[PDB]
């Protein structure tokens, strides 16, 4: 079963504890991790921070300690025009000039792959992106050639039907990548103006909006859909989201005045690390909806959906029952990575969590 970890770039920036460099990674905890993001610069893959050559050198020396650990750099994220990738892939020439930049950029910096990032394609771009995906991926196979293991090529798929029939052929691009990160925790929108989790595994009762807003669905759809069980992983997050309450109510619809407010130490309005969630947890009242199996607390005017460890380890198993090739947890940085926080003198809570239950039979 793969155990599949981002790493974040820009985690190094955040206040005292909440600074995080690939140091703090235990090396034995994932089986592959990522970095993100990189650029695309010129057409040509390139670092994003300042100090991306000395990060990425420090992440791939953890392979010194577990020369199994593999490592892949991803390119684009949300903080990269959609405008931009779709640039670079719909033209035969900036493809290709991308295409080629790709390993030797990797080999320099001692990855071991490729995910790609593009959040997310257009309709317009779906067709695209599997060309990109197939030309990168027999760019990969004519550098096998060269005597050195083939690089991997994977990919990070959002979970939500409509941006999946948008963007993604995922028949097509199921055959040339190595695996899919499915992102089963973006399932409760802006837009909204209520409280919801955001990743809950099943529907649950109470009034479906949608019965598509939830890591089943998205899972069974993608096996509809034609890829294959072995090269998908679900993806769990670390981080919770929150709202500011606009009423005393609390409960299934209850009405949000909008994002809550920042954490102490991530900065950002409308999410919060699961080490500053074991926090706010003194406190609070927490429930458990017991439909979607998955947790929310909340205190003042402060509402929090989030996943625990009993909530990562249900979904892990629902993983293994379902037979796919492992999880994505979204990410290192954000779970309690300095073990300090949550009680318990335990390091990537929720990580090990996962991990303990991928090796149970
Ligand atoms: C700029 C910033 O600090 N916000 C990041 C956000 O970009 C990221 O999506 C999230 C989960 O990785 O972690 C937050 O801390
Ligand atoms: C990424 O590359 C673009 C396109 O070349 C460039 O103009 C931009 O400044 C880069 N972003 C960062 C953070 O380096």
Same mark, same amino acid.
């Given at each position: 079963?793969?155990?599949?970890?981002?790493?974040?770039?820009?985690?190094?920036?955040?206040?005292?504890?909440?600074?995080?460099?690939?140091?703090?990674?235990?090396?034995?905890?994932?089986?592959?991790?990522?970095?993100?993001?990189?650029?695309?610069?010129?057409?040509?893959?390139?670092?994003?921070?300042?100090?991306?050559?000395?990060?990425?050198?420090?992440?791939?020396?953890?392979?010194?300690?577990?020369?199994?650990?593999?490592?892949?750099?991803?390119?684009?994220?949300?903080?990269?025009?959609?405008?931009?990738?779709?640039?670079?892939?719909?033209?035969?020439?900036?493809?290709?000039?991308?295409?080629?930049?790709?390993?030797?950029?990797?080999?320099?910096?001692?990855?071991?792959?490729?995910?790609?990032?593009?959040?997310?394609?257009?309709?317009?771009?779906?067709?695209?992106?599997?060309?990109?995906?197939?030309?990168?991926?027999?760019?990969?196979?004519? @550098?096998?050639?060269?005597?050195? @293991?083939?690089?991997?090529? &994977?990919?990070?798929?959002?979970?939500?039907?409509?941006?999946?029939?948008?963007?993604?052929?995922?028949?097509?691009?199921?055959?040339?990548?190595?695996?899919?990160?499915?992102?089963?925790?973006?399932?409760?929108?802006?837009?909204?103006?209520?409280?919801?989790?955001?990743?809950?595994?099943?529907?649950?009762?109470?009034?479906? &909006?949608?019965?598509?807003?939830?890591?089943?669905?998205?899972?069974?759809?993608?096996?509809?859909?034609?890829?294959?069980?072995?090269?998908?992983?679900?993806?769990?997050?670390?981080?919770?989201? &929150?709202?500011?309450?606009?009423?005393?109510?609390?409960?299934?619809?209850?009405?949000?005045?909008?994002? #809550?407010?920042?954490?102490?130490?991530?900065?950002?309005?409308?999410?919060?690390?699961?080490?500053?969630?074991?926090?706010?947890?003194?406190?609070?009242?927490?429930?458990?909806?017991?439909?979607?199996?998955?947790?929310?607390?909340?205190? #003042?005017?402060?509402?929090?959906?989030?996943?625990?460890?009993?909530?990562?380890?249900?979904?892990?198993?629902?993983?293994?029952?379902?037979?796919?090739?492992?999880?994505?947890?979204?990410?290192?940085?954000?779970?309690?990575?300095?073990?300090?926080?949550?009680?318990?003198?335990?390091?990537?809570?929720?990580?090990?969590?996962?991990?303990?239950?991928?090796?149970?039979?």
């Amino acid at each position: 079963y793969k155990l599949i970890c981002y790493y974040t770039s820009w985690s190094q920036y955040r206040e005292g504890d909440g600074s995080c460099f690939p140091d703090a990674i235990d090396p034995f905890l994932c089986t592959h991790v990522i970095y993100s993001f990189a650029n695309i610069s010129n057409n040509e893959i390139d670092t994003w921070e300042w100090n991306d050559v000395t990060l990425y050198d420090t992440l791939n020396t953890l392979k010194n300690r577990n020369p199994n650990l593999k490592t892949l750099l991803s390119v684009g994220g949300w903080n990269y025009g959609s405008q931009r990738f779709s640039k670079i892939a719909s033209k035969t020439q900036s493809r290709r000039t991308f295409i080629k930049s790709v390993p030797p950029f990797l080999r320099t910096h001692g990855f071991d792959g490729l995910d790609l990032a593009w959040l997310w394609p257009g309709w317009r771009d779906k067709r695209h992106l599997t060309t990109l995906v197939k030309e990168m991926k027999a760019e990969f196979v004519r @550098e096998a050639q060269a005597g050195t @293991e083939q690089l991997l090529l &994977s990919a990070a798929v959002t979970a939500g039907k409509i941006a999946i029939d948008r963007g993604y052929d995922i028949a097509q691009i199921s055959r040339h990548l190595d695996f899919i990160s499915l992102l089963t925790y973006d399932f409760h929108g802006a837009w909204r103006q209520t409280v919801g989790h955001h990743s809950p595994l099943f529907r649950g009762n109470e009034d479906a &909006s949608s019965r598509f807003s939830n890591a089943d669905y998205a899972v069974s759809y993608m096996l509809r859909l034609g890829a294959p069980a072995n090269k998908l992983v679900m993806g769990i997050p670390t981080f919770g989201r &929150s709202y500011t309450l606009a009423s005393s109510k609390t409960d299934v619809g209850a009405p949000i005045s909008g994002p #809550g407010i920042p954490g102490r130490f991530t900065k950002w309005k409308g999410i919060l690390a699961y080490y500053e969630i074991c926090d706010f947890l003194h406190g609070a009242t927490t429930h458990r909806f017991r439909d979607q199996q998955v947790p929310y607390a909340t205190k #003042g005017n402060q509402w929090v959906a989030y996943d625990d460890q009993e909530s990562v380890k249900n979904k892990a198993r629902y993983l293994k029952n379902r037979q796919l090739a492992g999880a994505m947890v979204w990410a290192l940085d954000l779970d309690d990575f300095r073990g300090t926080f949550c009680g318990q003198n335990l390091t990537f809570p929720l990580t090990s969590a996962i991990k303990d239950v991928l090796a149970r039979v």
